[PDB]
Design a binder for this molecule. Structure first.
Ligand SMILES: O=C1O[C@](O)(Cc2ccc(Cl)cc2)C(c2c[nH]c3cc(Cl)ccc23)=C1Cc1ccc(Cl)cc1
Length: 94
């Protein structure tokens, strides 16, 4: 438990591109909990095959919409606070 329970349930309003991303893997809402956002990101990552083959906890998102949104070419799925930081730039808490 890296992230406070209440923060994980924060109601959030993705910005237009993050929203676009989430809907492209089947999300149907305008607002989400952070847990839900993470669910659809997981789907996105797996379908777009962005995991590194050798280091399966590393996501290579360079040249992908995800990389544009997060502002980085790669990250570790083990660093939740870092991921949250990157996600927060792409939404607003309601
Ligand atoms: O490491 C994971 O792989 C997943 O299976 C898919 C994933 C989601 C988001 C990101 Cl940025 C990277 C990978 C996963 C999950 C997180 N929530 C879930 C809900 C379900 Cl039902 C299944 C998998 C996961 C996790 C857990 C997790 C938890 C918090 C954060 Cl910030 C990032 C990932």
């Amino acid at each position: 438990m890296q992230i406070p329970a209440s923060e994980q349930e924060t109601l959030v309003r993705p910005k237009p591109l993050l929203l676009k991303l989430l809907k492209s893997v089947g999300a149907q809402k305008d607002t989400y909990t952070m847990k839900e956002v993470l669910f659809y990101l997981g789907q996105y990552i797996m379908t777009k095959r962005l995991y590194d083959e050798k280091q399966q906890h590393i996501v290579y998102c360079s040249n992908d919409l995800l990389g544009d949104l997060f502002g980085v070419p790669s990250f570790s799925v083990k660093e939740h606070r870092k991921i949250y930081t990157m996600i927060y730039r792409n939404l607003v808490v309601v």
